[PDB]
Amino acid sequence: QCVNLTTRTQLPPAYTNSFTRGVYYPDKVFRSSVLHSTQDLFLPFFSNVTWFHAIHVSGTNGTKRFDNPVLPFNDGVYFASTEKSNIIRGWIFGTTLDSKTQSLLIVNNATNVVIKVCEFQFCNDPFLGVYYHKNNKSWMESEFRVYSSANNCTFEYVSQPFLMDLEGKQGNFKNLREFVFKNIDGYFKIYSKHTPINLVRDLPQGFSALEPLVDLPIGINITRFQTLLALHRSYLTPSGWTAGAAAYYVGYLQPRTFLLKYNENGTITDAVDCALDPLSETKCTLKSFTVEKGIYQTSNFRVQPTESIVRFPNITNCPFGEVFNATRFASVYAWNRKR
Amino acid sequence: ISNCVADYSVLYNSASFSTFKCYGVSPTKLNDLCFTNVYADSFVIRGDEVRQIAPGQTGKIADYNYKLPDDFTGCVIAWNSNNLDSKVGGNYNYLYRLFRKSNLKPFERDISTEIYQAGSTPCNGVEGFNCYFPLQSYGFQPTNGVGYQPYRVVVLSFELLHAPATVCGPKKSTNLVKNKCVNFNFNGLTGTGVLTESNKKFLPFQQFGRDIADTTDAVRDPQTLEILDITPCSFGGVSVITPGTNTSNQVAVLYQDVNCTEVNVFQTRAGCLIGAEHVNNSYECDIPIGAGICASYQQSIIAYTMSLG
């Protein structure tokens, strides 16, 4: 198991600025045509997202490269995935991703999505396969290379599949999905929405709010996650690997303050990221997207102190040696208090 | 079984119950506390072992099979199971052990059936002299009475570990009455007001709405997914209009900005005014009521719309 062959790549990631992406409903409250200010975890506007490459697109005779390895995830990340075809069943959320620790499992299984929060023994390369078995005349979806042992069964989940096909126009949309993985107070939340992509690889400047899907009462301390993939084998369509290709993006969340517009029917039409530039701070204090001419006081700024010092006087002394460097000690009935 | 809704009140009128033995939880208030996890174990015990099998007991059985934490938060069920473990011939398959070294710890699975000696010589794996067996079989006989009969016992023991709690029961329910001043409880939202039928649009993941300054306005009914408005029950000051205590003792009362239907009777732009009769004349103002309407006393108290000159 766990076919281990990369041995060639150490390329640095591509860095881009996500124009206006990563806006959510940090509540379940309807709001009329209102402007609201929230202080929760958000992606800063125009941040350097590490553009990772999925299974590569290098067509000579098959031979698609796999250069999307293990990743760290501090507090919250985005998974903006094009995925013209199904390539990711889920992710490897967890703490250490080995035995004795519960690996948070999300798998497509697109009849009923299962979440199995139990101890597992995943290896570096869990992968898929969908082909015949000479019986039942179909392309069954065995997932045996994903996990070896399912131990200490504790949690279950059965519901509709997250991902679906909605293009209907010979592609050219890719049905972009973006996801958020927050775990605070042990509650795991996911946000998603279907969006089209007109560029070949890059992200547009459109604005879209991503509604919540699931609240999970898991309750596990979080250190690091990992990404999953799907490499079904190959057959006489020119060993057997390298099927599928897409493009991925991974960012990082930060505690930021947002001013979110609301339509007459709850859709967040626009938002502004405070603490980027003076103009954004001016809007955030006034709570307005249109600011008239004038001079406005936004905030204070102090000169933070540099390295601290402490000063104390001289004459840091008595001869304690005269107590211990005595040549001989006295009898145990003549204890001395050399004050 | 976890992350669902539990019920205990129905368990009072389900079968023939014998003795209510509860530790750490009042039996009349079983629907208050939230625990982390549920370990549902329901099995069969002996008759006199409702007391003879219990936490903190010595002798043969309770010391060495399992130990449960003496800090229970729950109840111990006791039924009569003379038709379960007593069969003619004997259900001697199970094991009432005699003695072991020491006790256990709560919520441990220590099941080993090792043979315990009485002396010190080693049997070398062969049963014989001085190799006394601490295992003894269950003794069940239909002829034997309470001293050996079985009793259905379900122990619902809950841990006091430090973890989030998820499993509790709800506080349902009542019906709905609209367009009336009532105090409502909607999914943990406690308030009072007038419930009516709305025409707004919630997104299909929200519970309740608010316009500005945390003033909740609409709450979706979680039975029919209908959006219900919230309007606060009407109020307002009460004013007493008097022509002087020596002129007369007759007064008229004004309710500040309150509709008449929610209290002669007359409706002004400044509230509802009772006790004063509206006239079509227009005189110089005497007692200003508001919004261009004044009142005076000329053998009854009457209301105008003041004239400028």
Epitope: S99, Q121, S148, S149, N151 | -
Partner: nanobody, 116 residues
């Protein structure tokens, strides 16, 4: 809990039953598992044993009653038994490294298979 025993129960004389023992990993199989019982008076004779690489050897004189199979998806164990008799009057155990004594192993739950 490394090893958990699945299935089993009281057996009527002249009946049959199937056992199970979910395994934590294929690595703990090294190099002899155990479908151990406590027969009355009869010595401790191993019945079910197997190897991490997927081998199987059974005692020649006691293999007319016991069959073994596995699946690697759930790491569940199959002990399909036929014609149960009175020589099983105890509760079983499926414990790894049983042959190395009774102190270098983890004890799970076990199952009872007895007849009159």
């Amino acid at each position: 809990v490394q090893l958990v025993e699945s299935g089993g129960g009281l057996v009527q004389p002249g009946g049959s039953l199937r056992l199970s023992c979910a395994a934590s990993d294929s690595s703990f199989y090294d190099y002899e598992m155990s479908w151990v019982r406590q027969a009355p008076g009869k010595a401790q004779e191993w019945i079910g044993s197997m190897y991490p690489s997927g081998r199987t050897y059974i005692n020649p004189s006691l293999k007319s009653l016991v069959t073994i199979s596995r699946d690697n998806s759930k790491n569940t164990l199959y002990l399909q038994l036929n014609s149960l008799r009175a020589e099983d009057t105890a509760m079983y155990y499926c414990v790894s490294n049983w042959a190395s004594g009774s102190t270098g192993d983890y004890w799970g739950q076990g199952t009872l298979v007895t007849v009159s």
